[PDB]
Amino acid sequence: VGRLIYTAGGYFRQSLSYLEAYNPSNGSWLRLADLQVPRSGLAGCVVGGLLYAVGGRNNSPDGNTDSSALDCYNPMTNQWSPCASMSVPRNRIGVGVIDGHIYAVGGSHGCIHHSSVERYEPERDEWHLVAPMLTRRIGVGVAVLNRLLYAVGGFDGTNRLNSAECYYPERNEWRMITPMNTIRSGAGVCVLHNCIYAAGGYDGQDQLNSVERYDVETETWTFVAPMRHHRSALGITVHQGKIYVLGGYDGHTFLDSVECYDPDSDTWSEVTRMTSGRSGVGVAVTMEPC
């Protein structure tokens, strides 16, 4: 089917503009068109086969600029095109897609910690604010399951969170769900099968390698096999029934390792390494560029 794991931006010494794509079929990496502005703490997502880079921050030697930008990469043309900007800058944002619409969740702007949420309409090229979360969350994990939007963990400006909430679009309303077993900010959050996975993160004391998953039916969080590396501010995505985690920060170095979770065997294995270690990347999956 020819889909790649795209990684956009990230941080190592400074915010980066790399766009690189990994092919699990042959293990190859491709460096593609750079982002127009270097961004870390951004989020990636895909709508209509187009890759989107949302929010983040340019942590440069001379500046610390939070981003409200929404930029669209087209694999057919290998070019970035700007889109309408969000209502507010959002560093360490969370992003989910429901029915072709992009939801931007939380994130930080200076010392402000957002509870606000806004929804992007690609063909109309418009952002609109929706109901804010019950909790302010930066470094929040966000995923979509059964057309419901989940915001998991993060940092409210005072405490790191094990809490999580769910957004029900037809009622424009947020509801708390079962809290995680572990306090997690900067975790990788994705959906695999009928479960929301929360991998890694920071509990206030150490970077985590534990992973727990939420069964939306039973409303319980259960630990699965831990990752090989402790990591927070990691990239995460799902590809053909497996979780891929990319990079992050383990408290010592910026990782380049890419681990892969197989739910059938409940095991993690390293499948490749990124061209360089980095944290705070935006990751998504779409067609290969040609």
């Binding site: 870390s40 703490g41 610390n64 501010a233 705070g280």
Partner: peptide, 10 residues
């Protein structure tokens, strides 16, 4: 250092 991301703040 931002212990969650590894980023230098100043």
């Amino acid at each position: 250092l931002d212990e969650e991301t590894g980023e230098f703040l100043p």
